Design an enzyme around this catalytic site. Sequence first.
Site, short mmCIF file in Angstrom:
data_model
loop_
_atom_site.label_atom_id
_atom_site.label_comp_id
_atom_site.label_asym_id
_atom_site.label_seq_id
_atom_site.Cartn_x
_atom_site.Cartn_y
_atom_site.Cartn_z
N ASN A 165 0.97 -1.18 0.14
CA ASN A 165 0.07 -0.01 -0.18
C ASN A 165 1.02 1.23 -0.12
OD1 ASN A 165 -2.01 1.79 0.29
ND2 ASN A 165 -2.53 1.34 2.41
N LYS A 209 0.05 4.17 -0.31
CA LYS A 209 -0.62 5.26 0.48
C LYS A 209 -0.45 6.46 -0.25
CE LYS A 209 -0.49 3.01 4.94
NZ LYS A 209 -0.40 3.20 6.49
N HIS A 226 -9.67 0.28 4.80
CA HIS A 226 -8.42 0.64 5.47
C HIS A 226 -8.70 1.43 6.80
CE1 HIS A 226 -4.35 2.16 6.18
NE2 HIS A 226 -3.94 1.00 5.35
N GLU A 246 -7.04 3.92 8.04
CA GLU A 246 -7.22 5.40 7.48
C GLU A 246 -8.45 5.94 7.17
OE1 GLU A 246 -3.46 5.42 5.40
OE2 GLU A 246 -2.48 4.95 7.22
N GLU A 255 -5.64 -5.09 10.70
CA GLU A 255 -4.79 -3.96 11.13
C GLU A 255 -4.73 -3.74 12.71
OE1 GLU A 255 -4.66 -0.68 8.21
OE2 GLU A 255 -6.67 -1.15 7.99
N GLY A 276 0.74 4.12 16.07
CA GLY A 276 0.44 5.61 16.34
C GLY A 276 0.00 5.69 17.80
N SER A 311 2.76 -3.38 11.90
CA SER A 311 4.17 -3.15 11.38
C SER A 311 4.93 -4.25 10.82
CB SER A 311 4.80 -2.41 12.46
OG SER A 311 6.08 -1.91 12.01
C1 LIG Z 1 -3.60 5.86 11.90
C2 LIG Z 1 -4.21 4.86 12.65
C3 LIG Z 1 -5.50 5.36 13.30
O1 LIG Z 1 -6.22 6.19 12.19
O2 LIG Z 1 -6.22 5.46 14.15
C4 LIG Z 1 -4.22 3.39 11.88
O3 LIG Z 1 -4.78 2.42 12.66
O4 LIG Z 1 -3.92 3.48 10.62
#
Ligand SMILES: CC(C(=O)O)C(=O)O
Lengths: 245, 245
Positions: B8, B10, B92, B94, B162, B168, B208
């Site tokens: 991806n 992005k 996704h 995001e 994910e 983050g 990751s």
């Molecule tokens: C950046 C993060 C979120 O949007 O909470 C993610 O899981 O990609």
Amino acid sequence: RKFFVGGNWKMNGRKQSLGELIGTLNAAKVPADTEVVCAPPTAYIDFARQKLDPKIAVAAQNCYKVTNGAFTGEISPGMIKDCGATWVVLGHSERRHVFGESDELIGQKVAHALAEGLGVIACIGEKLDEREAGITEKVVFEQTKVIADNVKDWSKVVLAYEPVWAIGTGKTATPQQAQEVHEKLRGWLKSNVSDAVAQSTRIIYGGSVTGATCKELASQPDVDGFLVGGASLKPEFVDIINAKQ
Amino acid sequence: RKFFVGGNWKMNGRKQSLGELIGTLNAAKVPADTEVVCAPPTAYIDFARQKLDPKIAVAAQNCYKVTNGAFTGEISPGMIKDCGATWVVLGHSERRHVFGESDELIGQKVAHALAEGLGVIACIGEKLDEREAGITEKVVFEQTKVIADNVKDWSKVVLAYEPVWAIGTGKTATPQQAQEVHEKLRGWLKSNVSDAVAQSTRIIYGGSVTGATCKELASQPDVDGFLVGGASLKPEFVDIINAKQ
Ligand SMILES: CC(C(=O)O)C(=O)O
Ligand SMILES: CC(C(=O)O)C(=O)O
Ligand SMILES: [Br-]
Ligand SMILES: [Br-]
């Protein structure tokens, strides 16, 4: 002020039909002192720029507020420029009201897109409930203030008034109602930016416009062109380009 | 299950650097029984498909839920296919958590994209507060149910977990924690769709992953590949393609 006609193709088109539309647009005789911009779907920005004659500029329909990053599904001004486009539409009513984009985000996008060298068609407009509550001016002035707070060079900006209250609600905006808001917006620019900016900035109308109604709308003294939706996909768009003729 | 590695990109890249990345990817020797998909920014779907060898498939990073319409800034499955892409990433993190896309909308997008012939990489995952509240399973099972309710043909779907709670936030997801969720998701498919669908559906990890960690993650029994973020822009992506070697 140079008459400005933008064609927002929205989420419509495939290569065959967009190539056809582009042939029709290229064949138009753009009248003097008239600026024409087309906004293809994002997957076709490069395609459309290759096929459109340079007499017509290309706009992206949206962008994000930084040059690269972890924003799946977004594009940046740098990508728009790399595809040969020179404008972006920001703050469109569909982004604000279908996709939830806030004034704060729109202002940040405006700042970044302008800093990166794009022109911006910055869209404002009040919804049904705002119109009914009598707060047209409060809403569109606050939206315009957010935009203006993020503009360093007004020669790169066109404002587009969308009567969101008269799109998909059962209400009709008359030419007099459109003119009334455009005059108020120009007066806001005079009082809050400068008279010079007020007199030179194009304020284009983004409500319903067709070949049959465009001349009357264009004759309104503070209506400087159009951001056209559905008619932009059809040969009738050429008649709208000729609205001042 | 065929190991599946998605890259991806992005909101990153311009033609020069994406062409460079594509040269590196084309030169990779894709190992047996390995499926590789790249997701360029939307302005570059067509560009990337032209330059990538067909051994690598192209995905759009998002799409909308009807084939054409008044949705400034969106693209449809029909446009994705017209640009030569055969996948789309939907749901996704995001899109859900930066851009506010609801489960209901994601399900509608899944139904439309699949009906139009695309493959879907359907993303699920729980946020920080959901993890801390102990509701990982409730969240990801409900997200997967919405997806499953909109799937007619599971051969066209890949699920991507994910760990949003570990992106983050200051939290790290261990390989054992990733495996634990993947196993639970596969068990959901067994109990709510069928054993056959559970055994054949790829569930790829979207947390990751680097060249240094990919082999250990890939060895987890219910981790069937990756949806790679930042490393997908670098030659290290080729090492991730080779995670089972
Ligand atoms: C950046 C993060 C979120 O949007 O909470 C993610 O899981 O990609
Ligand atoms: C569709 C409508 C709205 O989103 O409220 C518009 O003004 O475009
Ligand atoms: Br009315
Ligand atoms: Br931790």
